PDB file of all heavy atoms in Angstrom:
ATOM      1  N   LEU A   9      43.837 112.420  98.912  1.00 34.95           N
ATOM      2  CA  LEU A   9      43.417 111.235  99.688  1.00 34.95           C
ATOM      3  C   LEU A   9      41.968 110.843  99.475  1.00 34.95           C
ATOM      4  O   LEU A   9      41.101 111.714  99.305  1.00 34.95           O
ATOM      5  CB  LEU A   9      43.675 111.443 101.191  1.00 34.95           C
ATOM      6  CG  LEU A   9      45.131 111.656 101.611  1.00 34.95           C
ATOM      7  CD1 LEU A   9      45.190 112.225 103.034  1.00 34.95           C
ATOM      8  CD2 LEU A   9      45.946 110.375 101.502  1.00 34.95           C
ATOM      9  N   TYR A  21      46.532  98.276 109.891  1.00 36.37           N
ATOM     10  CA  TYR A  21      46.800  98.467 111.320  1.00 36.37           C
ATOM     11  C   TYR A  21      46.075  97.431 112.217  1.00 36.37           C
ATOM     12  O   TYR A  21      46.681  96.876 113.163  1.00 36.37           O
ATOM     13  CB  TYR A  21      46.482  99.911 111.736  1.00 36.37           C
ATOM     14  CG  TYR A  21      47.658 100.820 111.441  1.00 36.37           C
ATOM     15  CD1 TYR A  21      47.747 101.525 110.231  1.00 36.37           C
ATOM     16  CD2 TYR A  21      48.704 100.925 112.339  1.00 36.37           C
ATOM     17  CE1 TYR A  21      48.833 102.342 109.963  1.00 36.37           C
ATOM     18  CE2 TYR A  21      49.801 101.726 112.074  1.00 36.37           C
ATOM     19  CZ  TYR A  21      49.846 102.440 110.889  1.00 36.37           C
ATOM     20  OH  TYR A  21      50.945 103.211 110.631  1.00 36.37           O
ATOM     21  N   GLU A  24      47.763  94.051 111.671  1.00 35.08           N
ATOM     22  CA  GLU A  24      49.058  93.934 112.336  1.00 35.08           C
ATOM     23  C   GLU A  24      48.903  93.875 113.858  1.00 35.08           C
ATOM     24  O   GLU A  24      49.681  93.199 114.524  1.00 35.08           O
ATOM     25  CB  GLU A  24      50.065  95.013 111.873  1.00 35.08           C
ATOM     26  CG  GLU A  24      50.432  94.986 110.378  1.00 35.08           C
ATOM     27  CD  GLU A  24      50.897  93.619 109.835  1.00 35.08           C
ATOM     28  OE1 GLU A  24      51.227  92.681 110.601  1.00 35.08           O
ATOM     29  OE2 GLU A  24      50.929  93.463 108.599  1.00 35.08           O
ATOM     30  N   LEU A  31      51.377  86.430 117.865  1.00 28.73           N
ATOM     31  CA  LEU A  31      52.794  86.142 118.068  1.00 28.73           C
ATOM     32  C   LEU A  31      53.146  86.026 119.549  1.00 28.73           C
ATOM     33  O   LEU A  31      53.821  85.093 119.965  1.00 28.73           O
ATOM     34  CB  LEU A  31      53.642  87.234 117.392  1.00 28.73           C
ATOM     35  CG  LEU A  31      55.137  87.308 117.669  1.00 28.73           C
ATOM     36  CD1 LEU A  31      55.899  86.151 117.017  1.00 28.73           C
ATOM     37  CD2 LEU A  31      55.614  88.649 117.108  1.00 28.73           C
ATOM     38  N   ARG A  34      51.972  82.707 120.820  1.00 29.11           N
ATOM     39  CA  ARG A  34      52.871  81.629 120.380  1.00 29.11           C
ATOM     40  C   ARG A  34      54.216  81.610 121.118  1.00 29.11           C
ATOM     41  O   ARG A  34      54.691  80.537 121.549  1.00 29.11           O
ATOM     42  CB  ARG A  34      53.105  81.655 118.865  1.00 29.11           C
ATOM     43  CG  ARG A  34      51.866  81.439 118.008  1.00 29.11           C
ATOM     44  CD  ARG A  34      52.265  81.230 116.548  1.00 29.11           C
ATOM     45  NE  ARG A  34      53.034  82.342 115.964  1.00 29.11           N
ATOM     46  CZ  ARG A  34      52.507  83.435 115.406  1.00 29.11           C
ATOM     47  NH1 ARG A  34      51.193  83.602 115.354  1.00 29.11           N
ATOM     48  NH2 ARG A  34      53.306  84.362 114.880  1.00 29.11           N
ATOM     49  N   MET A  38      55.940  78.764 123.429  1.00 24.72           N
ATOM     50  CA  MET A  38      57.362  78.445 123.159  1.00 24.72           C
ATOM     51  C   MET A  38      58.295  78.614 124.350  1.00 24.72           C
ATOM     52  O   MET A  38      59.279  77.853 124.479  1.00 24.72           O
ATOM     53  CB  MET A  38      57.887  79.230 121.956  1.00 24.72           C
ATOM     54  CG  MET A  38      57.356  78.683 120.640  1.00 24.72           C
ATOM     55  SD  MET A  38      57.424  79.910 119.339  1.00 24.72           S
ATOM     56  CE  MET A  38      59.190  80.149 119.152  1.00 24.72           C
ATOM     57  N   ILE A  45      62.822  71.752 127.833  1.00 19.63           N
ATOM     58  CA  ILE A  45      63.852  71.107 127.012  1.00 19.63           C
ATOM     59  C   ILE A  45      65.292  71.522 127.340  1.00 19.63           C
ATOM     60  O   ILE A  45      66.235  70.836 126.942  1.00 19.63           O
ATOM     61  CB  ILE A  45      63.556  71.190 125.488  1.00 19.63           C
ATOM     62  CG1 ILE A  45      63.597  72.629 124.989  1.00 19.63           C
ATOM     63  CG2 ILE A  45      62.214  70.534 125.160  1.00 19.63           C
ATOM     64  CD1 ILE A  45      63.404  72.752 123.496  1.00 19.63           C
ATOM     65  N   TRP A  46      65.452  72.622 128.070  1.00 17.17           N
ATOM     66  CA  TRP A  46      66.754  73.039 128.576  1.00 17.17           C
ATOM     67  C   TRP A  46      66.742  72.977 130.047  1.00 17.17           C
ATOM     68  O   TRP A  46      65.676  72.992 130.665  1.00 17.17           O
ATOM     69  CB  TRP A  46      67.088  74.480 128.186  1.00 17.17           C
ATOM     70  CG  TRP A  46      67.724  74.641 126.829  1.00 17.17           C
ATOM     71  CD1 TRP A  46      68.273  73.652 126.011  1.00 17.17           C
ATOM     72  CD2 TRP A  46      67.901  75.894 126.084  1.00 17.17           C
ATOM     73  NE1 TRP A  46      68.744  74.188 124.832  1.00 17.17           N
ATOM     74  CE2 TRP A  46      68.558  75.531 124.815  1.00 17.17           C
ATOM     75  CE3 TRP A  46      67.592  77.226 126.327  1.00 17.17           C
ATOM     76  CZ2 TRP A  46      68.891  76.485 123.865  1.00 17.17           C
ATOM     77  CZ3 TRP A  46      67.919  78.178 125.350  1.00 17.17           C
ATOM     78  CH2 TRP A  46      68.545  77.813 124.149  1.00 17.17           C
ATOM     79  N   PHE A  54      66.701  83.230 128.893  1.00 20.50           N
ATOM     80  CA  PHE A  54      65.700  83.615 127.912  1.00 20.50           C
ATOM     81  C   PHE A  54      64.493  84.294 128.542  1.00 20.50           C
ATOM     82  O   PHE A  54      64.070  85.328 128.049  1.00 20.50           O
ATOM     83  CB  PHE A  54      65.264  82.449 127.018  1.00 20.50           C
ATOM     84  CG  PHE A  54      64.111  82.792 126.110  1.00 20.50           C
ATOM     85  CD1 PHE A  54      64.321  83.498 124.935  1.00 20.50           C
ATOM     86  CD2 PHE A  54      62.809  82.433 126.446  1.00 20.50           C
ATOM     87  CE1 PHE A  54      63.263  83.833 124.103  1.00 20.50           C
ATOM     88  CE2 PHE A  54      61.747  82.766 125.619  1.00 20.50           C
ATOM     89  CZ  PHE A  54      61.973  83.464 124.443  1.00 20.50           C
ATOM     90  N   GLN A  57      64.730  88.119 129.727  1.00 24.83           N
ATOM     91  CA  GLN A  57      64.756  89.057 128.603  1.00 24.83           C
ATOM     92  C   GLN A  57      63.419  89.102 127.877  1.00 24.83           C
ATOM     93  O   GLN A  57      62.916  90.167 127.582  1.00 24.83           O
ATOM     94  CB  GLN A  57      65.834  88.651 127.613  1.00 24.83           C
ATOM     95  CG  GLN A  57      67.245  88.848 128.153  1.00 24.83           C
ATOM     96  CD  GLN A  57      68.278  88.467 127.121  1.00 24.83           C
ATOM     97  OE1 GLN A  57      68.343  89.059 126.038  1.00 24.83           O
ATOM     98  NE2 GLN A  57      69.075  87.465 127.434  1.00 24.83           N
ATOM     99  N   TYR A  58      62.860  87.929 127.595  1.00 24.62           N
ATOM    100  CA  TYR A  58      61.538  87.819 126.986  1.00 24.62           C
ATOM    101  C   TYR A  58      60.481  88.620 127.754  1.00 24.62           C
ATOM    102  O   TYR A  58      59.791  89.494 127.178  1.00 24.62           O
ATOM    103  CB  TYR A  58      61.115  86.346 126.864  1.00 24.62           C
ATOM    104  CG  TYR A  58      59.709  86.234 126.338  1.00 24.62           C
ATOM    105  CD1 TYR A  58      59.426  86.631 125.043  1.00 24.62           C
ATOM    106  CD2 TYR A  58      58.653  85.785 127.152  1.00 24.62           C
ATOM    107  CE1 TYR A  58      58.145  86.569 124.527  1.00 24.62           C
ATOM    108  CE2 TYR A  58      57.356  85.689 126.636  1.00 24.62           C
ATOM    109  CZ  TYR A  58      57.113  86.098 125.327  1.00 24.62           C
ATOM    110  OH  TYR A  58      55.861  86.069 124.774  1.00 24.62           O
ATOM    111  N   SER A  64      56.066  95.655 125.857  1.00 23.10           N
ATOM    112  CA  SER A  64      56.162  96.626 124.781  1.00 23.10           C
ATOM    113  C   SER A  64      55.425  96.108 123.549  1.00 23.10           C
ATOM    114  O   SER A  64      54.949  96.887 122.737  1.00 23.10           O
ATOM    115  CB  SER A  64      57.624  96.902 124.456  1.00 23.10           C
ATOM    116  OG  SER A  64      58.211  97.634 125.522  1.00 23.10           O
ATOM    117  N   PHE A  65      55.352  94.782 123.400  1.00 23.55           N
ATOM    118  CA  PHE A  65      54.518  94.202 122.360  1.00 23.55           C
ATOM    119  C   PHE A  65      53.037  94.453 122.637  1.00 23.55           C
ATOM    120  O   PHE A  65      52.287  94.714 121.709  1.00 23.55           O
ATOM    121  CB  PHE A  65      54.821  92.689 122.156  1.00 23.55           C
ATOM    122  CG  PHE A  65      56.070  92.430 121.339  1.00 23.55           C
ATOM    123  CD1 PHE A  65      57.317  92.839 121.787  1.00 23.55           C
ATOM    124  CD2 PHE A  65      55.986  91.805 120.097  1.00 23.55           C
ATOM    125  CE1 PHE A  65      58.461  92.631 121.019  1.00 23.55           C
ATOM    126  CE2 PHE A  65      57.125  91.588 119.334  1.00 23.55           C
ATOM    127  CZ  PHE A  65      58.365  92.009 119.786  1.00 23.55           C
ATOM    128  N   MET A  68      52.372  97.908 121.636  1.00 22.01           N
ATOM    129  CA  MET A  68      52.288  98.047 120.185  1.00 22.01           C
ATOM    130  C   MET A  68      50.897  97.626 119.712  1.00 22.01           C
ATOM    131  O   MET A  68      50.307  98.256 118.854  1.00 22.01           O
ATOM    132  CB  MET A  68      53.363  97.214 119.497  1.00 22.01           C
ATOM    133  CG  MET A  68      53.364  97.369 117.986  1.00 22.01           C
ATOM    134  SD  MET A  68      54.012  98.981 117.462  1.00 22.01           S
ATOM    135  CE  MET A  68      55.770  98.631 117.536  1.00 22.01           C
ATOM    136  N   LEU A  71      48.515 100.397 120.443  1.00 23.26           N
ATOM    137  CA  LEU A  71      48.771 101.521 119.499  1.00 23.26           C
ATOM    138  C   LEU A  71      48.204 101.274 118.116  1.00 23.26           C
ATOM    139  O   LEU A  71      47.519 102.130 117.567  1.00 23.26           O
ATOM    140  CB  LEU A  71      50.284 101.735 119.366  1.00 23.26           C
ATOM    141  CG  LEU A  71      50.759 102.692 118.261  1.00 23.26           C
ATOM    142  CD1 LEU A  71      50.260 104.069 118.621  1.00 23.26           C
ATOM    143  CD2 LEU A  71      52.288 102.644 118.235  1.00 23.26           C
ATOM    144  N   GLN A  78      41.176 105.283 114.601  1.00 23.93           N
ATOM    145  CA  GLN A  78      41.169 106.720 114.204  1.00 23.93           C
ATOM    146  C   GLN A  78      41.205 106.908 112.674  1.00 23.93           C
ATOM    147  O   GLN A  78      40.660 107.887 112.149  1.00 23.93           O
ATOM    148  CB  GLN A  78      42.344 107.463 114.850  1.00 23.93           C
ATOM    149  CG  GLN A  78      42.201 107.709 116.362  1.00 23.93           C
ATOM    150  CD  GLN A  78      40.841 108.305 116.787  1.00 23.93           C
ATOM    151  OE1 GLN A  78      40.385 108.029 117.892  1.00 23.93           O
ATOM    152  NE2 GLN A  78      40.185 109.094 115.912  1.00 23.93           N
ATOM    153  N   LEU A  79      41.852 105.981 111.970  1.00 25.67           N
ATOM    154  CA  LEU A  79      41.822 105.968 110.488  1.00 25.67           C
ATOM    155  C   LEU A  79      40.448 105.672 109.911  1.00 25.67           C
ATOM    156  O   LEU A  79      40.024 106.275 108.931  1.00 25.67           O
ATOM    157  CB  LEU A  79      42.832 104.970 109.922  1.00 25.67           C
ATOM    158  CG  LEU A  79      44.296 105.452 109.989  1.00 25.67           C
ATOM    159  CD1 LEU A  79      45.262 104.311 109.732  1.00 25.67           C
ATOM    160  CD2 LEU A  79      44.520 106.581 108.984  1.00 25.67           C
ATOM    161  N   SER A  82      38.580 108.830 110.457  1.00 29.30           N
ATOM    162  CA  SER A  82      38.983 109.857 109.476  1.00 29.30           C
ATOM    163  C   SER A  82      38.429 109.528 108.102  1.00 29.30           C
ATOM    164  O   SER A  82      38.102 110.401 107.356  1.00 29.30           O
ATOM    165  CB  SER A  82      40.521 109.974 109.353  1.00 29.30           C
ATOM    166  OG  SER A  82      41.068 110.662 110.433  1.00 29.30           O
TER     167      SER A  82
ATOM    168  N   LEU B   9      64.329  63.332 125.387  1.00 29.01           N
ATOM    169  CA  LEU B   9      64.444  64.455 124.394  1.00 29.01           C
ATOM    170  C   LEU B   9      65.518  64.182 123.336  1.00 29.01           C
ATOM    171  O   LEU B   9      66.668  63.862 123.669  1.00 29.01           O
ATOM    172  CB  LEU B   9      64.686  65.803 125.094  1.00 29.01           C
ATOM    173  CG  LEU B   9      66.062  66.168 125.673  1.00 29.01           C
ATOM    174  CD1 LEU B   9      66.213  67.684 125.727  1.00 29.01           C
ATOM    175  CD2 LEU B   9      66.293  65.546 127.045  1.00 29.01           C
ATOM    176  N   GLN B  20      61.006  76.708 115.091  1.00 38.71           N
ATOM    177  CA  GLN B  20      59.915  77.545 115.602  1.00 38.71           C
ATOM    178  C   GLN B  20      60.475  78.901 115.981  1.00 38.71           C
ATOM    179  O   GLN B  20      59.917  79.932 115.593  1.00 38.71           O
ATOM    180  CB  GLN B  20      59.273  76.936 116.838  1.00 38.71           C
ATOM    181  CG  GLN B  20      58.377  75.740 116.585  1.00 38.71           C
ATOM    182  CD  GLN B  20      58.012  75.051 117.877  1.00 38.71           C
ATOM    183  OE1 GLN B  20      57.600  75.693 118.844  1.00 38.71           O
ATOM    184  NE2 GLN B  20      58.177  73.741 117.911  1.00 38.71           N
ATOM    185  N   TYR B  21      61.574  78.893 116.746  1.00 36.75           N
ATOM    186  CA  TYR B  21      62.260  80.137 117.134  1.00 36.75           C
ATOM    187  C   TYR B  21      62.800  80.931 115.943  1.00 36.75           C
ATOM    188  O   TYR B  21      62.681  82.164 115.919  1.00 36.75           O
ATOM    189  CB  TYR B  21      63.347  79.892 118.192  1.00 36.75           C
ATOM    190  CG  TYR B  21      62.800  79.859 119.600  1.00 36.75           C
ATOM    191  CD1 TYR B  21      62.395  78.649 120.194  1.00 36.75           C
ATOM    192  CD2 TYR B  21      62.647  81.037 120.339  1.00 36.75           C
ATOM    193  CE1 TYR B  21      61.867  78.636 121.477  1.00 36.75           C
ATOM    194  CE2 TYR B  21      62.125  81.030 121.623  1.00 36.75           C
ATOM    195  CZ  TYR B  21      61.719  79.810 122.180  1.00 36.75           C
ATOM    196  OH  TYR B  21      61.212  79.808 123.455  1.00 36.75           O
ATOM    197  N   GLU B  24      59.736  82.508 114.087  1.00 31.39           N
ATOM    198  CA  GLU B  24      59.217  83.672 114.842  1.00 31.39           C
ATOM    199  C   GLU B  24      60.176  84.869 114.802  1.00 31.39           C
ATOM    200  O   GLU B  24      59.742  86.034 114.660  1.00 31.39           O
ATOM    201  CB  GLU B  24      58.838  83.282 116.280  1.00 31.39           C
ATOM    202  CG  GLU B  24      57.728  82.211 116.399  1.00 31.39           C
ATOM    203  CD  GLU B  24      56.469  82.514 115.586  1.00 31.39           C
ATOM    204  OE1 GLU B  24      56.312  83.658 115.088  1.00 31.39           O
ATOM    205  OE2 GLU B  24      55.621  81.601 115.438  1.00 31.39           O
ATOM    206  N   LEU B  31      57.500  91.770 110.325  1.00 33.70           N
ATOM    207  CA  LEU B  31      56.534  92.697 110.945  1.00 33.70           C
ATOM    208  C   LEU B  31      57.074  94.128 111.045  1.00 33.70           C
ATOM    209  O   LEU B  31      56.386  95.069 110.645  1.00 33.70           O
ATOM    210  CB  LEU B  31      56.134  92.205 112.337  1.00 33.70           C
ATOM    211  CG  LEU B  31      55.162  93.073 113.145  1.00 33.70           C
ATOM    212  CD1 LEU B  31      53.867  93.320 112.370  1.00 33.70           C
ATOM    213  CD2 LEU B  31      54.879  92.375 114.465  1.00 33.70           C
ATOM    214  N   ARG B  34      56.935  95.768 107.718  1.00 32.85           N
ATOM    215  CA  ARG B  34      55.592  96.180 107.329  1.00 32.85           C
ATOM    216  C   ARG B  34      55.163  97.448 108.098  1.00 32.85           C
ATOM    217  O   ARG B  34      54.565  98.367 107.515  1.00 32.85           O
ATOM    218  CB  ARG B  34      54.580  95.026 107.461  1.00 32.85           C
ATOM    219  CG  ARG B  34      54.820  93.864 106.480  1.00 32.85           C
ATOM    220  CD  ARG B  34      53.670  92.879 106.414  1.00 32.85           C
ATOM    221  NE  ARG B  34      53.290  92.375 107.750  1.00 32.85           N
ATOM    222  CZ  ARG B  34      53.841  91.306 108.320  1.00 32.85           C
ATOM    223  NH1 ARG B  34      54.800  90.628 107.678  1.00 32.85           N
ATOM    224  NH2 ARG B  34      53.456  90.928 109.529  1.00 32.85           N
ATOM    225  N   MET B  38      54.096 101.190 106.850  1.00 39.85           N
ATOM    226  CA  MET B  38      52.831 101.753 107.341  1.00 39.85           C
ATOM    227  C   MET B  38      53.009 103.117 108.041  1.00 39.85           C
ATOM    228  O   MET B  38      52.228 104.033 107.795  1.00 39.85           O
ATOM    229  CB  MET B  38      52.120 100.737 108.246  1.00 39.85           C
ATOM    230  CG  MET B  38      51.582  99.524 107.495  1.00 39.85           C
ATOM    231  SD  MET B  38      51.308  98.061 108.532  1.00 39.85           S
ATOM    232  CE  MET B  38      50.075  98.726 109.658  1.00 39.85           C
ATOM    233  N   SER B  39      54.007 103.241 108.907  1.00 38.96           N
ATOM    234  CA  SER B  39      54.309 104.509 109.558  1.00 38.96           C
ATOM    235  C   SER B  39      54.581 105.644 108.530  1.00 38.96           C
ATOM    236  O   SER B  39      54.117 106.778 108.687  1.00 38.96           O
ATOM    237  CB  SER B  39      55.494 104.336 110.472  1.00 38.96           C
ATOM    238  OG  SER B  39      55.436 105.285 111.498  1.00 38.96           O
ATOM    239  N   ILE B  45      49.033 110.768 105.530  1.00 34.79           N
ATOM    240  CA  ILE B  45      47.573 110.812 105.662  1.00 34.79           C
ATOM    241  C   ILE B  45      47.193 111.903 106.652  1.00 34.79           C
ATOM    242  O   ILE B  45      46.219 112.635 106.430  1.00 34.79           O
ATOM    243  CB  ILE B  45      47.020 109.448 106.163  1.00 34.79           C
ATOM    244  CG1 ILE B  45      47.085 108.411 105.038  1.00 34.79           C
ATOM    245  CG2 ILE B  45      45.582 109.565 106.689  1.00 34.79           C
ATOM    246  CD1 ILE B  45      46.852 106.992 105.575  1.00 34.79           C
ATOM    247  N   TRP B  46      47.930 111.973 107.752  1.00 37.53           N
ATOM    248  CA  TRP B  46      47.584 112.875 108.829  1.00 37.53           C
ATOM    249  C   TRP B  46      48.630 113.923 109.093  1.00 37.53           C
ATOM    250  O   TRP B  46      49.805 113.735 108.805  1.00 37.53           O
ATOM    251  CB  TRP B  46      47.471 112.128 110.149  1.00 37.53           C
ATOM    252  CG  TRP B  46      46.188 111.390 110.378  1.00 37.53           C
ATOM    253  CD1 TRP B  46      44.917 111.666 109.888  1.00 37.53           C
ATOM    254  CD2 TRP B  46      46.032 110.230 111.235  1.00 37.53           C
ATOM    255  NE1 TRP B  46      43.996 110.719 110.370  1.00 37.53           N
ATOM    256  CE2 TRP B  46      44.621 109.848 111.176  1.00 37.53           C
ATOM    257  CE3 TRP B  46      46.905 109.477 112.016  1.00 37.53           C
ATOM    258  CZ2 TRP B  46      44.117 108.759 111.911  1.00 37.53           C
ATOM    259  CZ3 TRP B  46      46.373 108.373 112.732  1.00 37.53           C
ATOM    260  CH2 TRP B  46      45.022 108.030 112.649  1.00 37.53           C
ATOM    261  N   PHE B  54      51.180 109.456 118.009  1.00 39.56           N
ATOM    262  CA  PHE B  54      51.147 108.054 117.549  1.00 39.56           C
ATOM    263  C   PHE B  54      52.511 107.659 116.969  1.00 39.56           C
ATOM    264  O   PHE B  54      53.039 106.586 117.234  1.00 39.56           O
ATOM    265  CB  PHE B  54      50.074 107.850 116.462  1.00 39.56           C
ATOM    266  CG  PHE B  54      48.659 107.685 116.985  1.00 39.56           C
ATOM    267  CD1 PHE B  54      47.576 108.149 116.237  1.00 39.56           C
ATOM    268  CD2 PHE B  54      48.400 107.023 118.188  1.00 39.56           C
ATOM    269  CE1 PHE B  54      46.269 107.971 116.680  1.00 39.56           C
ATOM    270  CE2 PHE B  54      47.104 106.839 118.627  1.00 39.56           C
ATOM    271  CZ  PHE B  54      46.033 107.313 117.884  1.00 39.56           C
ATOM    272  N   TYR B  58      55.317 104.679 118.216  1.00 51.12           N
ATOM    273  CA  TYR B  58      55.886 103.649 117.365  1.00 51.12           C
ATOM    274  C   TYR B  58      57.418 103.660 117.420  1.00 51.12           C
ATOM    275  O   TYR B  58      58.060 102.598 117.534  1.00 51.12           O
ATOM    276  CB  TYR B  58      55.436 103.785 115.912  1.00 51.12           C
ATOM    277  CG  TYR B  58      56.096 102.752 115.053  1.00 51.12           C
ATOM    278  CD1 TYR B  58      55.821 101.381 115.241  1.00 51.12           C
ATOM    279  CD2 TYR B  58      57.048 103.109 114.087  1.00 51.12           C
ATOM    280  CE1 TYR B  58      56.455 100.409 114.458  1.00 51.12           C
ATOM    281  CE2 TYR B  58      57.689 102.143 113.331  1.00 51.12           C
ATOM    282  CZ  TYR B  58      57.380 100.797 113.513  1.00 51.12           C
ATOM    283  OH  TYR B  58      58.019  99.835 112.759  1.00 51.12           O
ATOM    284  N   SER B  64      62.407  97.685 121.048  1.00 46.06           N
ATOM    285  CA  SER B  64      61.990  96.403 121.678  1.00 46.06           C
ATOM    286  C   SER B  64      61.737  95.274 120.703  1.00 46.06           C
ATOM    287  O   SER B  64      62.077  94.128 120.991  1.00 46.06           O
ATOM    288  CB  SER B  64      60.797  96.617 122.593  1.00 46.06           C
ATOM    289  OG  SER B  64      61.153  97.566 123.580  1.00 46.06           O
ATOM    290  N   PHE B  65      61.139  95.588 119.553  1.00 46.89           N
ATOM    291  CA  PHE B  65      60.929  94.619 118.483  1.00 46.89           C
ATOM    292  C   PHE B  65      62.227  94.122 117.850  1.00 46.89           C
ATOM    293  O   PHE B  65      62.364  92.927 117.570  1.00 46.89           O
ATOM    294  CB  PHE B  65      59.986  95.181 117.409  1.00 46.89           C
ATOM    295  CG  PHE B  65      58.529  95.122 117.808  1.00 46.89           C
ATOM    296  CD1 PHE B  65      58.093  95.771 118.956  1.00 46.89           C
ATOM    297  CD2 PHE B  65      57.615  94.417 117.047  1.00 46.89           C
ATOM    298  CE1 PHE B  65      56.765  95.694 119.365  1.00 46.89           C
ATOM    299  CE2 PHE B  65      56.276  94.354 117.438  1.00 46.89           C
ATOM    300  CZ  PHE B  65      55.862  94.984 118.609  1.00 46.89           C
ATOM    301  N   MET B  68      63.758  91.751 120.338  1.00 46.94           N
ATOM    302  CA  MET B  68      63.050  90.454 120.300  1.00 46.94           C
ATOM    303  C   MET B  68      63.514  89.593 119.141  1.00 46.94           C
ATOM    304  O   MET B  68      63.805  88.427 119.328  1.00 46.94           O
ATOM    305  CB  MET B  68      61.519  90.638 120.257  1.00 46.94           C
ATOM    306  CG  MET B  68      60.753  89.317 120.284  1.00 46.94           C
ATOM    307  SD  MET B  68      60.786  88.627 121.958  1.00 46.94           S
ATOM    308  CE  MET B  68      59.525  89.612 122.788  1.00 46.94           C
ATOM    309  N   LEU B  71      66.918  88.234 120.145  1.00 48.32           N
ATOM    310  CA  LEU B  71      66.726  87.192 121.158  1.00 48.32           C
ATOM    311  C   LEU B  71      66.242  85.862 120.572  1.00 48.32           C
ATOM    312  O   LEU B  71      66.826  84.801 120.873  1.00 48.32           O
ATOM    313  CB  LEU B  71      65.800  87.682 122.286  1.00 48.32           C
ATOM    314  CG  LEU B  71      65.591  86.763 123.490  1.00 48.32           C
ATOM    315  CD1 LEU B  71      66.913  86.541 124.245  1.00 48.32           C
ATOM    316  CD2 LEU B  71      64.506  87.314 124.409  1.00 48.32           C
ATOM    317  N   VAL B  75      68.245  82.050 120.432  1.00 52.93           N
ATOM    318  CA  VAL B  75      67.673  80.816 120.978  1.00 52.93           C
ATOM    319  C   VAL B  75      67.658  79.737 119.897  1.00 52.93           C
ATOM    320  O   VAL B  75      68.063  78.609 120.153  1.00 52.93           O
ATOM    321  CB  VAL B  75      66.287  81.023 121.615  1.00 52.93           C
ATOM    322  CG1 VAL B  75      65.685  79.683 122.052  1.00 52.93           C
ATOM    323  CG2 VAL B  75      66.421  81.951 122.818  1.00 52.93           C
ATOM    324  N   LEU B  79      69.608  76.174 120.055  1.00 53.21           N
ATOM    325  CA  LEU B  79      68.855  74.915 120.028  1.00 53.21           C
ATOM    326  C   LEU B  79      69.420  74.020 118.925  1.00 53.21           C
ATOM    327  O   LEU B  79      69.684  72.830 119.156  1.00 53.21           O
ATOM    328  CB  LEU B  79      67.346  75.172 119.858  1.00 53.21           C
ATOM    329  CG  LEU B  79      66.654  75.738 121.105  1.00 53.21           C
ATOM    330  CD1 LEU B  79      65.290  76.332 120.779  1.00 53.21           C
ATOM    331  CD2 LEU B  79      66.506  74.655 122.173  1.00 53.21           C
ATOM    332  N   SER B  82      72.708  72.672 120.240  1.00 48.73           N
ATOM    333  CA  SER B  82      72.421  71.582 121.200  1.00 48.73           C
ATOM    334  C   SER B  82      72.087  70.257 120.532  1.00 48.73           C
ATOM    335  O   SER B  82      72.586  69.193 120.949  1.00 48.73           O
ATOM    336  CB  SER B  82      71.261  71.970 122.118  1.00 48.73           C
ATOM    337  OG  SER B  82      71.552  73.175 122.773  1.00 48.73           O
TER     338      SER B  82
END
Side-chain angles (χ1 to χ4, degrees):
Chain A
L9 298 164
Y21 276 93
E24 298 308 345
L31 169 71
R34 298 190 302 274
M38 286 158 66
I45 65 176
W46 274 347
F54 173 80
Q57 291 182 61
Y58 175 67
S64 290
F65 281 63
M68 183 73 82
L71 170 65
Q78 287 311 149
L79 284 166
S82 284
Chain B
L9 76 155
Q20 286 169 48
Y21 276 92
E24 299 309 348
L31 178 56
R34 294 192 307 272
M38 291 158 61
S39 206
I45 287 167
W46 280 332
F54 279 148
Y58 177 65
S64 302
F65 281 59
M68 183 75 79
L71 185 63
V75 175
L79 287 164
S82 304

